[PDB]
Ligand binder design. Structure first.
Ligand SMILES: Nc1ncnc2c1ncn2[C@@H]1O[C@H](COP(=O)(O)O)[C@@H](O)[C@H]1O
Ligand SMILES: Nc1ncnc2c1ncn2[C@@H]1O[C@H](COP(=O)(O)O)[C@@H](O)[C@H]1O
Lengths: 143, 143
């Protein structure tokens, strides 16, 4: 009974209707961590696209990023920028940040597993946010 | 304004009232992945304690575990056991599986960051499930 089904691994994100494409919560490179933490606790979404001055995705900020900040032995306050998370990892340069609607479920799954990341930002031709794909969305496709 | 606050890093899980201690969804070492996947998609919890024949915690099964299974190049079906996830990692032997109510937030945070894990099972003296602590619970303590 193969897991995952080969006929669904070969279908695109668009075809499978996988991800969230409305009401996306996101932040800027100039956003302090206190704003992200407020979003996580009060708005309750799992990952935040981080966009530069042009609206282009340059990182994804997760709840684990906050915990990583909290564990730092150097002195921090919450007025630190979300871009300080980049000292621990670069989702961007490892090619495990973004994805496209036309990409296959197999491609997306291989990308998640590549860096052990829980989410990808769906972008357009200008790297501008269209949606988000998280492990929950993939699990709905895997059923 | 220090992040995290030192006066809350020194407090225990019990003292901070961090974690979920009722209505815990969990599975057995004999549980097939199809049962875990159904739980994730329909019951909608982030991590499942995996308990042996004696009710003792021997693993934690996460949504990423399913994605990891899905990416395997060898042939699988969903009748595989949740214990096949153990081929990718041992939360147990790395000491990043369990925690106790009396442990400090700083200890718990350092443990999460140690293996880059998103959750811990709160256990008793017999390694039996008392609750679960996930990144969301920690974020509520960090505010
Ligand atoms: N920043 C976000 N804004 C809006 N929806 C999101 C965001 N991050 C994740 N989601 C969606 O939240 C749902 C649950 O995802 P998760 O919280 O990872 O289980 C999924 O459908 C995601 O696509
Ligand atoms: N297996 C589980 N059974 C019950 N509650 C859970 C389980 N896993 C996580 N939770 C709780 O679900 C809430 C949201 O956690 P998370 O889904 O990781 O954001 C937290 O209060 C967790 O303690």
């Amino acid at each position: 009974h193969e897991f995952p089904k080969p006929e669904f691994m070969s279908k695109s994100l668009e075809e499978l209707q996988i991800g969230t494409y409305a009401n996306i919560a996101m932040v800027r490179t100039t956003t302090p961590v206190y704003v992200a933490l407020g979003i996580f606790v009060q708005h309750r979404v799992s990952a935040l696209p981080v966009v530069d001055e042009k609206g282009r995705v340059v990182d994804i900020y997760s709840k684990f990023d906050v915990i990583n900040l909290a564990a730092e032995k150097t002195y921090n306050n919450l007025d630190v920028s979300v871009t300080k998370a980049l000292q621990h990892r670069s989702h961007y340069f490892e090619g495990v940040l973004k994805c496209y609607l036309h990409e296959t479920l197999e491609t997306i799954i291989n990308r998640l597993v590549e860096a052990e990341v829980h989410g990808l930002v769906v972008v357009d031709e200008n790297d501008v946010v269209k949606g988000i794909v998280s492990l929950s969305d993939i699990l709905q496709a895997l059923v």
